Every structure is written in structure tokens, then in C-alpha cells.
RNA sequence: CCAGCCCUAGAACAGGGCACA
RNA sequence: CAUUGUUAACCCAACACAGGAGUGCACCAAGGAAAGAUUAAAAGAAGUAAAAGGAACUCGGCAAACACAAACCCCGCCUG
């Protein structure tokens, strides 16, 4: 009795750069609902 | 309101058969319907069947049992009964159209959660055992045909076949007591999703079931 | 032996040649006339005729809905797909595609290219190979030929 | 497996010259009404479709422009037009591309 | 479908088909010149460590139309005289077997379930 | 001159093609319609049976496979085999073709005209009729000649005999030897590198060749075959359908040659038959739609039980 | 007669179809 | 306020080689593409599935397998 719609956002296994944007999108919503500062800063600084 | 009904035998193959041959498929099975009532019944309904048997007492032979699975074509339509008999368990493949069949009884119009319920073979016996002299059960058309949602046990590995396997899409098998999430997540392997969404590999009959049931209802009105 | 099969083996095998064509369709959806190989526009043309069918079916359809969801990898074209291609595909049955051959491609493996186009877009119209009009000779002859056979009737 | 003898040319002549391996004359070849090139009797005009196609390009790149973003797809039905067109009622309501260059010979009004 | 080194399952009530042992009664040889055995068709069987005849009552094989196929490849005891040596059958057994009375009289005068 | 190729919808308008269809098909359907009765135009004198005589055979298209029950409970196989379109093209005399028998050459279902050569479409201008697909050649007795022209019907068979059936095997086409002559392979994996299927040795050493009979892989498939000795059950009038009995070499839909059972013990079976042809505007009586065999369970049975 | 499009015909080459719909 | 090393897709294998490569970082926020285009003959390699039988093949249950167990001998204490 609705249309349903998917979300218009870009493909995840992608290899465009709006992919990528979503990839880091994901890990920084990761890096939000990560509980502790600890584990916070270990996920933001596990790059060297 | 009521739903239309078409047996699955008067559903052609997906071949490229000359519908002629169909026709007069249809045309003979028809006219052998008209002396035998073969009546509605699915997969997981119980029937009572005779037979014309030379070499008993009676020339008459009852067979009651469970319907595994029908399969075919026109006149050759064949299924499947399976009983089980004081342990040990027997299935015949009797056909739809042949001339032996005196009688054929539904005593209780039943469908299951699967559309071939083969692996009644790895099932347990308490599932396949049934009373040969039941009460034929009458139901109301209002209740279209209840689907009976019954979660079947399972005898351990090995089994017939590879039940577990996304090829068979069975739901009516209690998974989650006989297999283990190792071999769950493994069976997984052999999924193909694409299948579903492939859009080609479909039959879609409709104007080929639109045009039997009208051949169907003008050989009743003739 | 290869005996009364109608799909035709591409890419890396069965889930390789349902991406490819994934990607085409979504290509041809996007831009409403894309050019490939000729083997993989034959196959093509039937999976758009599948999809227009199901886009006809109404935008309610969860079936629908999900099948395009599946097919259509950019989501921005299901919207366009539901309501432009659908509504103005309504009185035609099956004549959704057109498919022509072109010249072979430039480069040095001069394969057979096709062009796959949906009717009724946006774009110049193609070079199609018209029939010969009705003032030459043997179709002059044919048009004689058909007056005779209505004045005798 | 290792060859006995040297193969003559007499022998080497009567393979490599054989009529099937010989290049066959393709008889199917006329010439374009439009433009006057050569094409096949199946096959359409090379000339005219690159024409086709550089036209096909532009309108891409311009319709493209005109969508700053990769995902902003047009909802509803387009047109395109040249100068010295107006949009008229049936074009109405339907996304509108505006090209400098004159309306060609080949693209039909409609 | 019953062939060589076929693990079969003795039916009939006898000691060689009761009491148990630390190998299962495997087949021999079946009688037919093709080494495929079928309904009705005689075999020899090890039981126990010794030689012995039998009678093929039914296998797990899909064979014709409207023909039973059991779940197990039941077999009874046959002597080499052409009679059984059990007492009685509890099995059902395929109708089919009546057929030829002539060669089976007395295997089927001891069946009591005919299906 | 470098003269191209052309075909009939290349200079054709979209106004004359469908003309054209129409054209060539109510002048088939015409000429069909004339040469529906021959019996009355001019029929040749129609000899009497001999012992020692022979009947032409037909054309047929196959359909499909059935199954069929007989009264005892047994249950057979037929096939369907329609004859669409029996035509007598031209008729070789007996010093002209064998000198022994006749030859009467026979033609299958119809054809488009736009696809054949000019000499065969000659030919069936001069004959009257449309092409036809698959032309074989029967060699019949000298009292059996019919009138070139002349159709035939599926009733030419009565419920109740032997036919032979020739046909194009179902081309498989350059296949290994196991699936054409049956050879065995080697074992699997017990240490066999690259031979899971080959022939292995061919001939012997001291021959230094293969010998001409050796089975070799090759063609498979596409060949003319004939099976012998098949029984006809069920004749149906009104669409010319024939049940003949077991499998018939070729594929569906395809045009298959049937004939009598040149068998010896089926050679002097003709006499009960009709035989020139069945000719349905002599007996002015008009049979029933299907001629059961005697021992064909019809569709309409009383589930006939045993006593 | 074989441009092109199919085939239960086929490695290529060959063979059968493309009018009833 | 001295001098020197700060590039690179790299080194060794005759090669832009499915090979040999020390240490610190997480398994992707970084790298790439198994397919030049067709048809889908035989044989060959790999994978998946297969009714009834479950080693009857074979020197050997070699490989494979919904199992991945228990025992008896010969030689060597065992790890190496
Ligand atoms: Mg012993
Ligand atoms: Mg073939
Ligand atoms: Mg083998
Ligand atoms: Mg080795
Ligand atoms: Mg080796
Ligand atoms: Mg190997
Ligand atoms: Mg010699
Ligand atoms: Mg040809
Ligand atoms: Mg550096
Ligand atoms: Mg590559
Ligand atoms: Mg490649
Ligand atoms: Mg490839
Ligand atoms: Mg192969
Ligand atoms: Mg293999
Ligand atoms: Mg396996
Ligand atoms: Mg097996
Ligand atoms: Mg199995
Ligand atoms: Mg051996
Ligand atoms: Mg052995
Ligand atoms: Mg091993
Ligand atoms: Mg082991
Ligand atoms: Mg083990
Ligand atoms: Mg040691
Ligand atoms: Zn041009």
C-alpha cells in the first residue's frame, strides 16, 4: 500500500571513490558506537 | 470465494514439444477422468489407493499411505505413497491414469511445509507410521486446504541425500537439533542466490493454464 | 553435447555471467542505448525485456521491488526505472528493445559489437536500415499486382 | 613428436595456397545512401554512427553537467532541444536539455 | 538392486537370521548371469561363516510402476532343496512374488503380508 | 560484373512484404484444397492385391512419446507420428529406377517457397503443389502405382501391424569413443596420468598400421537409421496421428519415413489392408476418430478388473 | 538461390528452417 | 650554521619469471583484476553432484569421501 524504496547511497565492495567515502563512513560509525575512550583511541590510531 | 485448482499434470514441460501432442494428451486424460474420479489432493495428504491385483484373494488390493511427491507429464503422471508396515517402511510409485486403479480415497487433505518431501526416508519411523483402517476425515471448502506446519525429527548422519543443501530449500526438517553451526555455515557453500533473482530460468504458464482450463470446462460441459 | 539450451556460457562462470549481465542491464538502464559484445547484447535483450515487464507490474510489488533492487546496482535508476520506462511502456507488449550490429571495433581484437537501445528515449534517432520505398520498380509491380486482386474481389 | 623430413616447397605451396585457407572475396559490400561510404548489407553505416555517436556524447556530457552529482538521476521523462526551439505543451513538465549547436539533418523533431 | 558384497537382512525366523554375530550376512553370488540381482531371483549368502541359500523378497532399488521398494534388502532363507528353512515371515513382501507359484510354493505358503 | 547477393525481403516495402505472405499462402492453401480430391479428377486403374506385392509408405512428423496400457495390465510405449502432408511428387518406372520394382517418390510437411533453389521450385510449379521439406523415394511393386499428385492420409495404416521407421538419428556429433562405440576406460586415480578415456592401443606391432575396421573416435549421431518390426496401436483420424510402438530413431519434431515391415514374418500382411491407399471418397463413409487396436485399453474403459 | 537470424545440425567447413503464429 | 644516506612501481633468480627474501604495524581507513571477442567438438587438468551396492578395482583403502575411530605384529626407547 507504500512504496518501499531502497536508500540511494553508493555500493560498499565497490571500488569508486564514493565507495571508498562509504567505507570510511562505516569505520567512523564504528569508531561513534565503540563504548570506551580507550578502545576509541586504539581503533583511531591502529594506523601507522 | 474459490480457487481454481489445476492438477499438476496438465502443466506441459518446458520443452518445445508440438502443443498437438499435449492436446490430445489432455483430450484422453480427460476422457479417462470421466470414469475415474481422481480427486484434489497435495503433497503430504494421505490417499487410499486400489489396485486389480491377479495373484491375491481378492482381486482387489488397498493401499493407504502418505504422498511423497507427484511428478510428470499428461498420461503419465506418477506418485508416490509411502507406509510404514509392522518397521519396515515401503513406497509405490502408483500413475494417476492407469487402468488397474479401482478406487482412489483422500482421507485427509493435508499440505506440508515442502513441495517433495523425500526425506521422509531419513525421518523417523513415527512419521511415516499410519493407521491402514483410519476414518476418512471430511473437511469444509472454507478451510482451504490447512498447511500443517509440523517440524519433523531426523535420524544422524549419514542421510539419504545432503538435506542440508541450499539446493533443496526445505524447511519442514528440524535443523537446529540433528546439525551443528560448523556444518550449517558449511552448507552454505553451495548456495547460489542468483538463481532467484535470474529472471529467465521461470515457466510462466498462465495463458497455457487459461487455455487447459477452458478445454477442461468445455469436455464437462460436453 | 550442447542439445536444447538457450543461455550461453560468459566471464568466470554462472555468477560471473550474472554480474556481467547486472552491469549491462544497469548501464542500459542508466544511459537508455549502450553498445557491447554481440553475444552479450543477444543475451541482454531478453533480461530487459524481463526487467520492463516487472517494472510494468506496479511500483507495490515487493517482488518487483526487490528484483530491481537486485538487478539495478545504482539505486538512483529503480525511481527513474518505476516511472519513466514503466508508465511509458503501457500498450506495448514486447517491443521494448532494439538491437543493430555495428561495424567491428577499431582495436585490434575486432569483435562483433552490437548496440542495444530502449525505444522512445531521448536520443538521436539511429541509422536504421529502412526498406525501399514504394515507387520502385518491383514494389510499383507489387502495388499493381495488389489493385488487380482487389478489383477482382 | 619430432618431423622425419624437411617438407619441401612444392608440398608447402600445396598446403599454405589451398582455397580454404585462401581469403574469400566478401560480396555483401554497398555504399550508404546518406553519406555516400561503404558499408554491409547487415551492418549499419559506419559514417552515420559516428555521427550518431559523437551527437550521443555531447548530449551525455551536457545532460551530465547538468547533474553535478553521480547519483542525481532525472525521476521523469527528457528532451532535448536545440536553438531556435521552445519547450511546447507535450514538453512540457519533462527535464530539458538546451544545446548552442542547430537541430542536424538526421534528428527528427517528433 | 542386490549384487556381490551386499549387506542384506535375513527376515525369515531362524537361528542363522536371530542369533547375532560379529560380521553381517553379506551376499555371494547371485544365480542370474548379469551380477545384478532382483526381486525373485535365488542368491547365495555367508552367513555366520558358512554357505547358505536365499530368495530375494525386496530391495531399496525404484524398480517398475507400482511396485513396493522397501527400505532394507530383505531376503529369506532358502534351502538348496528349494525350501525355506524359517518358520514364518513378518515382512509385508511384494504380490508380485505370486506370480510363479510354481518355483516359490513353499516360501510363500509361510508369508503372512502380501503387499 | 561483381553481381551481389540478394533475397526477397531485400528490395521488398513494408507494404508488399505482408502482401506477398498472403499471396504465396492462399495459393498454397488453394492448390492444397484442388488436389484434396483426386479420386475424382483422374485415378489411375487400381490393381488387385497380390502375394507378392508391396505398399508405399509416408512422411510423418514426430510429435512425442506416450504411454499406453494394454487389457492384460502390461503397460507399452508409443510414440506419435502425424502425417501433415503425404504427397506422390513424381513416379519412376521399374526399367527406369531398379528394374526389378517401382519407385514412387513421396514428399513431407510444407515449405516456404522464398528458401528453395530454381530447378526444385520448377519442378513443383510444373507439379502443383508447395515444396516440400524431406523427399524420399519407396520402392514398391508394379500393381501398386498411384497417380504423382495424389495425397495421403494417416488411415493408410490399420489398428493392428508391423511398420518399419527410417529416420536421422539425433546427431551428437564428434564424440570420444566410450560414447560411440562403448570402449572402457582406465581407472581413475590409481596412478593414471592423462589417459581417463583414451582408446589406448590401436592395432598390434608386427601390422605397423591400424586396420580400416579399427573404432576410432568420430561422427556420431547423424546418420540414417531404421528400426524394424514396430507395432501400430492407435490411428487417429481427425488430426492423422500414428502410435507406433517403442522408441523411433530421430528427434522430435522432425520428419520421419515409415513403411511397411519388410520382415519375413510380417510379408504378407497387405491383404486386409487397402491397397493402392486409403482413399477416403470411395467408401463415402467417414471412420471413427480413433481405430483402437483389439487389445488397446481405450480412454473410455470400465477399469476393467481381473477375474 | 544462399546475404543475414535460429536449429533437437554442427570444431571450422557442412545440413535443415525463417508464410500462416 | 661541518660532512654524508633521504627518488622510485626497486633486490637475487638469463626475463616486467605462479620462485627466495630480515623487522615493526591492522586485516583494510590500503592494493589489484581470474575473462582479447566468439562457438561450446574429442581428449587432458580442476571443481561440484550422483539412484542400488560400500573396496567387490588395485601390490597396497593411492586419490577421494556426510567418517576422520579401535585394535594386532616387525623395526627402531622417544624429540631430532
Ligand atoms: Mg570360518
Ligand atoms: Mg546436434
Ligand atoms: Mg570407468
Ligand atoms: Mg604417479
Ligand atoms: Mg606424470
Ligand atoms: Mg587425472
Ligand atoms: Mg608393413
Ligand atoms: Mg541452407
Ligand atoms: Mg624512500
Ligand atoms: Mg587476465
Ligand atoms: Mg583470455
Ligand atoms: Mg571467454
Ligand atoms: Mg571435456
Ligand atoms: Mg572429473
Ligand atoms: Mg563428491
Ligand atoms: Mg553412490
Ligand atoms: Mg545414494
Ligand atoms: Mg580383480
Ligand atoms: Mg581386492
Ligand atoms: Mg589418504
Ligand atoms: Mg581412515
Ligand atoms: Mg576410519
Ligand atoms: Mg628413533
Ligand atoms: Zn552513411
Redesign the pocket.
Known amino acids: 500500500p507504500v512504496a518501499r524504496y531502497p536508500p540511494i547511497v553508493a555500493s560498499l565492495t565497490a571500488?569508486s571513490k564514493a565507495a571508498?567515502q562509504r567505507?570510511?563512513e562505516?569505520?567512523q560509525a564504528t569508531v561513534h558506537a565503540a563504548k570506551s575512550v580507550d578502545e576509541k583511541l586504539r581503533?583511531?590510531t591502529?594506523?601507522? | 470465494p474459490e480457487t481454481r485448482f489445476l492438477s499438476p499434470e496438465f502443466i506441459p514441460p518446458r520443452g518445445?514439444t508440438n502443443p498437438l501432442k499435449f492436446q490430445i494428451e489432455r483430450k484422453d486424460m480427460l476422457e479417462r477422468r470421466k470414469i475415474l474420479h481422481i480427486p484434489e489432493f497435495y503433497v503430504g495428504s494421505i490417499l487410499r489407493v486400489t489396485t486389480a491385483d491377479p495373484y491375491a484373494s481378492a482381486k482387489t488390493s488397498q493401499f493407504l499411505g502418505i504422498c511423497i511427491q507427484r511428478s510428470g507429464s499428461g498420461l503419465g503422471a506418477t506418485f508416490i505413497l509411502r507406509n510404514t508396515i509392522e518397521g519396515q517402511g515401503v513406497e509405490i510409485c502408483f500413475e494417476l491414469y492407469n487402468p488397474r486403479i479401482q478406487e482412489i480415497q483422500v482421507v485427509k487433505l493435508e499440505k506440508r511445509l515442502d513441495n517433495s518431501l523425500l526425506y521422509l526416508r531419513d525421518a523417523l519411523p513415527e512419521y511415516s507410521t499410519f493407521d491402514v483402517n483410519m476414518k476418512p476425515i471430511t473437511q469444509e471448502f472454507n478451510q482451504e486446504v490447512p498447511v500443517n506446519q509440523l517440524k519433523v525429527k531426523m535420524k544422524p548422519?549419514?542421510?539419504?541425500?545432503?538435506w542440508e543443501?541450499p539446493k533443496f530449500n526445505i524447511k519442514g526438517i528440524r535443523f537446529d537439533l540433528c546439525l551443528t553451526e560448523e556444518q550449517m555455515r558449511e552448507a552454505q557453500k553451495?548456495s547460489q542466490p542468483w538463481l532467484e533473482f535470474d529472471m529467465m530460468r521461470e515457466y510462466d504458464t498462465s495463458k497455457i493454464e487459461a487455455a487447459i482450463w477452458d478445454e477442461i470446462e468445455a469436455s464437462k460441459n460436453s | 553435447?550442447?542439445?536444447?539450451?538457450?543461455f550461453?556460457?560468459?566471464?568466470?562462470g554462472p555468477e560471473?555471467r550474472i554480474h556481467?549481465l547486472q552491469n549491462l542491464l544497469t548501464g542500459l538502464v542508466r544511459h537508455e542505448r549502450i553498445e557491447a559484445?554481440?553475444?552479450?547484447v543477444?543475451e541482454l535483450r531478453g533480461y530487459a525485456e524481463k526487467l520492463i515487464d516487472y517494472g510494468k507490474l506496479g511500483d507495490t510489488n515487493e517482488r518487483a521491488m526487490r528484483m530491481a533492487d537486485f538487478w539495478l546496482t545504482e539505486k538512483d535508476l529503480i525511481p527513474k526505472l518505476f516511472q519513466v520506462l514503466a508508465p511509458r511502456f503501457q500498450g506495448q507488449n514486447g517491443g521494448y528493445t532494439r538491437m543493430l550490429?555495428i561495424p567491428n571495433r577499431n582495436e585490434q581484437?575486432?569483435?562483433?559489437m552490437a548496440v542495444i537501445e530502449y525505444k522512445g528515449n531521448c536520443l538521436p534517432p539511429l541509422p536504421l536500415p529502412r526498406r525501399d520505398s514504394n515507387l520502385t520498380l518491383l514494389n510499383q509491380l507489387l502495388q499493381g499486382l495488389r489493385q488487380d486482386q482487389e478489383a477482382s474481389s | 613428436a619430432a618431423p622425419k623430413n624437411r617438407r619441401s616447397i612444392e608440398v608447402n605451396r600445396c598446403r599454405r595456397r589451398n582455397p580454404?585457407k585462401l581469403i574469400k572475396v566478401?560480396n555483401?559490400i554497398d555504399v550508404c545512401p546518406e553519406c555516400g561510404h561503404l558499408k554491409?548489407?547487415?551492418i549499419l553505416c559506419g559514417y552515420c554512427y559516428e555521427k550518431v555517436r559523437k551527437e550521443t556524447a555531447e548530449i551525455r556530457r551536457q545532460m551530465g553537467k547538468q547533474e553535478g552529482g553521480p547519483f542525481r538521476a532525472p525521476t521523469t521523462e527528457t528532451v532535448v532541444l536545440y536553438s531556435g526551439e521552445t519547450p511546447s505543451e507535450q514538453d512540457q513538465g519533462k527535464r530539458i536539455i538546451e544545446r548552442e549547436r542547430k537541430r542536424p539533418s538526421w534528428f527528427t523533431q517528433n | 538392486?542386490?549384487?556381490?558384497?551386499?549387506?542384506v537382512r535375513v527376515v525369515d525366523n531362524s537361528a542363522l537370521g536371530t542369533t547375532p554375530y560379529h560380521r553381517p550376512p553379506?551376499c555371494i553370488h547371485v544365480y542370474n548371469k548379469t551380477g545384478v540381482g532382483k526381486v525373485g531371483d535365488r542368491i547365495l549368502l555367508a552367513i555366520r561363516g558358512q554357505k547358505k541359500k536365499a530368495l530375494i523378497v525386496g530391495?531399496?532399488?525404484?524398480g517398475p510402476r507400482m511396485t513396493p521398494r522397501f527400505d532394507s534388502?530383505n531376503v529369506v532363507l532358502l534351502e538348496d532343496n528349494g525350501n525355506p528353512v524359517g518358520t514364518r515371515i513378518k515382512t509385508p513382501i511384494p504380490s508380485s512374488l505370486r506370480q510363479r507359484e510354481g518355483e516359490f510354493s513353499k516360501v510363500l505358503a509361510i508369508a503372512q503380508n502380501f503387499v | 560484373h561483381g553481381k551481389s547477393?540478394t533475397?526477397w525481403?531485400?528490395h521488398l516495402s513494408e507494404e508488399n512484404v505482408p502482401f506477398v505472405?498472403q499471396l504465396?499462402?492462399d495459393?498454397?492453401?488453394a492448390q492444397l484444397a484442388s488436389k484434396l480430391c483426386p479420386l475424382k479428377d483422374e485415378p489411375w486403374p487400381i490393381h488387385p492385391w497380390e502375394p507378392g506385392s508391396s505398399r508405399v509408405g509416408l512422411i510423418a512428423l514426430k510429435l512425442g512419446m506416450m504411454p499406453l496400457w494394454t487389457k492384460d495390465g502390461q503397460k507399452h510405449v508409443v510414440t506419435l507420428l502425424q502425417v501433415q502432408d503425404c504427397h506422390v511428387l513424381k513416379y519412376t518406372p521399374k526399367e527406369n529406377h531398379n528394374g526389378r520394382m517401382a519407385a514412387l517418390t513421396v514428399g513431407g510437411k510444407?515449405?516456404?517457397?522464398?528458401?528453395?533453389?530454381?530447378?526444385?521450385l520448377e519442378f513443383y510449379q510444373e507439379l502443383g503443389l508447395?515444396?516440400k521439406?524431406k523427399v524420399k523415394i519407396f520402392n514398391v511393386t508394379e500393381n501398386a502405382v498411384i497417380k504423382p499428385g495424389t495425397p495421403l492420409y494417416a488411415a493408410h495404416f490399420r489398428p493392428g501391424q508391423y511398420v518399419d521407421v527410417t529416420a536421422?538419428t539425433?546427431?551428437?556429433?564428434?564424440?570420444?569413443?566410450?560414447?560411440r562405440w562403448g570402449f572402457k576406460?582406465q581407472?581413475?586415480?590409481?596412478?593414471?596420468?592423462?589417459?581417463?578415456?583414451?582408446p589406448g592401443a590401436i592395432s598390434t606391432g608386427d601390422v605397423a598400421r591400424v586396420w580400416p575396421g579399427t573404432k576410432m573416435?568420430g561422427?556420431?549421431?547423424?546418420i540414417d537409421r531404421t528400426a524394424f518390426g514396430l507395432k501400430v496401436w492407435r490411428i487417429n483420424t481427425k488430426h492423422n496421428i500414428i502410435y507406433v510402438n517403442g522408441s523411433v530413431p530421430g528427434?522430435?519434431?522432425?520428419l520421419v519415413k515409415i513403411k511397411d515391415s519388410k520382415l519375413p514374418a510380417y510379408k504378407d500382411f497387405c491383404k486386409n489392408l487397402p491397397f493402392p491407399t486409403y482413399f477416403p471418397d470411395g467408401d463415402e463413409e467417414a471412420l471413427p476418430e480413433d481405430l483402437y487396436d483389439e487389445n488397446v485399453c481405450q480412454p473410455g474403459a470400465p477399469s476393467i478388473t481381473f477375474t
Open positions: 571500488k571508498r567505507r570510511v562505516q569505520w581503533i583511531l591502529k594506523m601507522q | 518445445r548422519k549419514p542421510w539419504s541425500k545432503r543443501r553451495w | 553435447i550442447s542439445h536444447g539450451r538457450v550461453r556460457r560468459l566471464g568466470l560471473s556481467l559484445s554481440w553475444a552479450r543477444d550490429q581484437d575486432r569483435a562483433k | 580454404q566478401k555483401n554491409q548489407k547487415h | 538392486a542386490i549384487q556381490k558384497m551386499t549387506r553379506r530391495h531399496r532399488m525404484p534388502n | 547477393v533475397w525481403d531485400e505472405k504465396v499462402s495459393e498454397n492453401k510444407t515449405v516456404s517457397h522464398f528458401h528453395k533453389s530454381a530447378s526444385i508447395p515444396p521439406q536421422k539425433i546427431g551428437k556429433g564428434f564424440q570420444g569413443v566410450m560414447r576406460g581407472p581413475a586415480t590409481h596412478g593414471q596420468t592423462k589417459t581417463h578415456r583414451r573416435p561422427q556420431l549421431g547423424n528427434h522430435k519434431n522432425c
